[PDB]
């Protein structure tokens, strides 16, 4: 029942909202996972690893360049906005709202969300392989060598860009090769971030799960913590639940969520 949810919403003084790929999907962002989510020959599993990058950093950058470029035409959907505006409205009332997102497309940022935790990093940050510096970067194209590259056609010719011309660190002494500041398969999360999120989820008195479910990674690292304190948890996603069954609102976050937060 929705009214039942809103009664909590009304009381809640510290809301945490966990967001997953469902919400980026509704803005038309490809996840590259499972059926028909190929990029050329490969899927994300294949390319989003340190080995792939060591082996073929031109190819990996072609991939990530493409992903950066397709964001120029995907906009935040109503879910993104309804969140950001909710954060704003409630902050004015001294009530907090934080986003913990598994998405790396900066859509929440572009919606106007402020207190956001990007646990898998972001397509629009780099990390220097040599000095470890983390810079924002939105340059299209990120470097000239990649201009007009990274086409997704299965049959596209590899650009086979020499490493020295891929994105490099600007600190003159360094010039290290840059990598996307995104968490790849086989890498750990930043524990500083996890420790902050832990703190936020301990504080919270209502938790929302959006475009993913509490049973699955990464919602599952946490909801146990919040739920075991007796805090309500509301999911908004497209999965069913059985006849005989913490609230669930089946359907597109674009539709379900804004009424919920108005």
């Amino acid at each position: 029942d929705l009214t039942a949810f809103r009664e909590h919403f009304a009381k809640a003084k510290h809301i945490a909202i966990i967001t997953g790929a469902g919400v980026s999907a509704e803005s038309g962002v490809p996840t590259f996972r499972g059926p028909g989510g190929f990029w050329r020959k490969w899927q994300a599993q294949d390319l989003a690893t340190p080995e792939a990058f060591s082996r073929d950093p031109s190819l990996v950058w072609e991939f990530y360049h493409y992903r950066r470029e397709v964001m120029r035409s995907k906009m935040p959907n109503p879910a993104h906005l309804a969140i950001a505006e909710c954060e704003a409205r409630l902050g004015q009332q001294g009530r907090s709202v934080v986003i913990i997102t598994q998405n790396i497309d900066e859509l929440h940022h572009r919606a106007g969300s402020k207190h956001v935790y990007e646990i898998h990093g972001s397509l629009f940050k780099t990390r220097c392989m040599s000095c470890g510096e983390v810079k924002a970067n939105h340059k299209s194209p990120i470097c000239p060598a990649l201009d007009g590259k990274g086409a997704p056609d299965p049959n596209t010719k590899e650009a086979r860009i020499p490493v020295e011309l891929l994105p490099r660190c600007e600190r003159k002494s360094c010039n290290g090769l840059l990598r996307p500041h995104v968490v790849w398969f086989g890498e750990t999360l930043d524990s500083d971030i996890l420790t902050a999120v832990e703190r936020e989820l301990e504080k919270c008195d209502l938790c929302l799960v959006v475009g993913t479910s509490s049973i699955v990674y990464p919602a599952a690292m946490f909801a146990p913590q919040v739920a075991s304190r007796g805090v309500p948890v509301a999911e908004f996603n497209m999965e069913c639940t059985p006849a005989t069954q913490k609230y669930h609102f089946e359907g597109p976050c674009g539709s379900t969520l804004p009424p919920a937060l108005e």
Binding site: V183, G186, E187, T188, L189, L194, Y217, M221
Partner: peptide, 8 residues
């Protein structure tokens, strides 16, 4: 540190 997807 936590493996993403739990490494699965």
């Amino acid at each position: 540190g936590v493996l993403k997807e739990y490494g699965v």
